[PDB]
């Protein structure tokens, strides 16, 4: 197991939704920041999500569609960031060196294939 701690959608925000995730599930792909100074990419992702989605705690006050739309809005101007999208346990690799926006697309496709939308 290798962990970035970056679920998209976030664990707390997915609770009760078709794509809910439990933290023991190390198969669900997460985002891993690439490049020099990953703390800054991580901070930029945090701050964009804080601006659009809100606090890490609490429900997301909106539909599944709005929640995915919110990540896409948050990530719209982050195309210079690169992430990997992969399972912490290594079982799936969805993307390598992709933009945060692309990562949302990859996760949506994977969840649909898995029956989780």
């Amino acid at each position: 197991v290798s962990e970035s701690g970056h679920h998209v959608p976030a664990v707390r925000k997915s609770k009760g939704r078709p794509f809910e995730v439990s933290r023991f599930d190390k198969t669900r792909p997460t985002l891993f920041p690439r490049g020099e100074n990953p703390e800054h990419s991580a901070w930029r992702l945090h701050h964009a999500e804080r601006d659009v989605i809100g606090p890490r705690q609490g429900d997301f006050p909106g539909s599944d569609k709005e929640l995915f739309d919110a990540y896409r809005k948050a990530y719209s101007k982050l195309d210079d960031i690169r992430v990997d999208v992969k399972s912490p346990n290594g079982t799936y690799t969805l993307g390598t060196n992709v933009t945060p926006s692309k990562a949302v697309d990859l996760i949506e496709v994977w969840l649909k294939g898995q029956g989780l939308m």
Binding site: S4, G5, H6, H7, P38, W43, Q57
Partner: protein
Amino acid sequence: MINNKLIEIDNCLSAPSFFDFLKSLNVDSALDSRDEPEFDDCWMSEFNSLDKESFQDDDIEFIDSLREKAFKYSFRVINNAEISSRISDDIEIISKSFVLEKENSWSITHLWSSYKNGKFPE
């Protein structure tokens, strides 16, 4: 002017090894506990109350610099985005609570006191 309590938070966050306790954290257990209603409802109650208040622009700007420090200094220890995000959010509401001089404040007596005692609040 920047509120003196915020300068004190800066001094604490910037102290050597402030976040080293994260090396011993059971991340999944702590976040699971924070996502349960007892903690989550309390946190959101603090957030919702503070969101109705009005803050000076220099304090808000300075709080954003405190969030960045809390995020990045904690990220350097265990490289966990959700932990660092929750610490940043905690520092936001801790800071606002100090500026409002809130007494009996859960943000201060639980969240901030946790950090000062080398623990991730849950």
